[PDB]
Amino acid sequence: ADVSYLTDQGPGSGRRVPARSWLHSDAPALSLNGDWRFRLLPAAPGTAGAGSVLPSGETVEGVAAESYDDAAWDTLPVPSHWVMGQDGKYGRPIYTNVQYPFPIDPPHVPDANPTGDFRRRFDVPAQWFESTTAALTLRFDGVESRYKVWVNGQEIGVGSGSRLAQEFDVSDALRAGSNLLVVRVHQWSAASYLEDQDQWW
Amino acid sequence: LSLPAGGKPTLAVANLRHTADASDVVLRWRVEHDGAVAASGEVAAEGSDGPLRAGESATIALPAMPAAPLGETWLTVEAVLRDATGWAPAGHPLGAVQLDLSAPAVPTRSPRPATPLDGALPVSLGPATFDAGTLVSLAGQPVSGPRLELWRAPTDNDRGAGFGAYGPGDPWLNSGRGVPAPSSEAVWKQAGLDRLTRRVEDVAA
Ligand SMILES: [Cl-]
Numbered sequence: 149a150d151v152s153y154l155t156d157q158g159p160g161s162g163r164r165v166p167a168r169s170w171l172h173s174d175a176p177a178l179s180l181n182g183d184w185r186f187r188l189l190p191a192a193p194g195t196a197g198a199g200s201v202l203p204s205g206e207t208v209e210g211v212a213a214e215s216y217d218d219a220a221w222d223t224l225p226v227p228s229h230w231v232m233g234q235d236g237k238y239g240r241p242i243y244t245n246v247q248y249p250f251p252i253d254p255p256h257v258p259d260a261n262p263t264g265d266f267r268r269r270f271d272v273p274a275q276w277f278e279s280t281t282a283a284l285t286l287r288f289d290g291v292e293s294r295y296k297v298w299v300n301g302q303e304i305g306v307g308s309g310s311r312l313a314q315e316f317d318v319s320d321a322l323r324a325g326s327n328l329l330v331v332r333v334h335q336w337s338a339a340s341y342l343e344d345q346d347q348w349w
Numbered sequence: 350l351s352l353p354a355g356g357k358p359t360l361a362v363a364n365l366r367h368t369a370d371a372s373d374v375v376l377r378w379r380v381e382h383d384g385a386v387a388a389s390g391e392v393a394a395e396g397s398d399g400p401l402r403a404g405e406s407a408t409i410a411l412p413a414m415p416a417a418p419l420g421e422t423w424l425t426v427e428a429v430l431r432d433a434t435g436w437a438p439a440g441h442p443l444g445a446v447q448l449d450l451s452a453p454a455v456p457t458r459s460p461r462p463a464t465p466l467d468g469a470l471p472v473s474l475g476p477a478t479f480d481a482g483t484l485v486s487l488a489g490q491p492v493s494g495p496r497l498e499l500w501r502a503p504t505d506n507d508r509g510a511g512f513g514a515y516g517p518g519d520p521w522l523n524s525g526r527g528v529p530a531p532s533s534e535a536v537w538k539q540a541g542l543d544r545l546t547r548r549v550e551d552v553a554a
């Protein structure tokens with residue numbers, strides 16, 4: 149399983165939609181915001197230093213599958229930061245001004261890399277698949293830092309740019325009725341080198 | 350101590366005292382093969398006219414001591430008090446010297462450097478057990494490591510900054526006062542030597 153996306157120095161990958169304005173449109177839309185199933189892993193699965201981070205039997209990217217046992221997972225509000233509002237259950241904010249909190253060894257990041265897996269079931273109206281609709285777009289307005297996205301088990305792409313919006317074309321992955329969105333979010337990635345603002349991580 | 354070519358071990362002795370001769374001292378020797386005593390004896394600290402006098406030196410040939418053919422052979426000589434005083438017991442040591450007499454070493458033959466393989470990592474090797482390439486036990490007990498360390502708990506000297514440091518210049522210059530500099534501890538902490546992080550680049554069978 150290829151996890152070079154974590155250290156890649158490119159703009160992101162997959163079914164990317166060309167950049168456009170954030171507009172007030174009357175197009176049909178829905179918010180995926182709410183309480184999502186969540187777990188925090190101490191390391192990025194599939195990396196050389198994370199050989200036993202996942203539960204027995206789970207494959208590196210098996211979290212994407214529609215056939216997945218997440219029964220025991222906690223829930224986390226989205227939007228939120230996992231290091232805020234949880235009494236430290238998932239770690240705490242880290243404040244640096246100039247210094248990076250990891251070695252300056254671009255584009256490599258530490259083995260201790262809090263990685264959040266998010267699983268969200270949602271419904272999409274049957275009418276969105278009629279010919280009056282040309283395409284279906286999934287939009288993330290902000291994720292810190294890099295993340296990979298799967299819809300109904302299909303890899304959709306990888307996003308970077310923590311405070312920048314990113315749209316993906318999910319026309320071919322969605323179906324009428326019940327759907328699964330899975331997002332894996334890493335605290336540290338190659339993008340962290342571009343994001344050394346004087347603020348809390 | 351020295352071993353003159355084809356000769357036997359030679360002990361140089363100097364009585365560096367202000368007044369007393371060496372009649373109160375006995376020179377004890379032992380030869381050990383990998384730490385186990387093989388032979389041992391005593392000689393007296395004698396000069397050209399009785400006990401070695403304050404300011405006098407002598408050289409004495411010790412018995413032949415052929416090297417063990419395998420392992421290491423070490424000679425130890427110690428000057429010890431013959432008799433108790435009010436402040437020390439009979440046989441109290443004053444100082445000691447060693448000489449390596451070992452036969453030419455047979456360095457053990459290390460395994461050839463090997464090319465990494467594809468596929469599964471071993472889960473155990475000899476007394477070691479691994480969980481995805483991470484050590485978890487040795488000889489029946491939980492163990493972690495090895496982990497590189499460059500830090501040591503700074504000594505009081507490591508924390509000093511009065512004299513200068515000797516690194517940046519010939520130490521014989523500037524009356525041997527060094528070049529003004531922070532403490533070792535200060536530079537170690539500034540370099541982050543106390544907080545090294547370990548990143549795994551790759552693991553392979
Ligand atoms: Cl570490």
Ligand code: NA
Binds near residue numbers: 246
């Ligand atoms: Na910063």
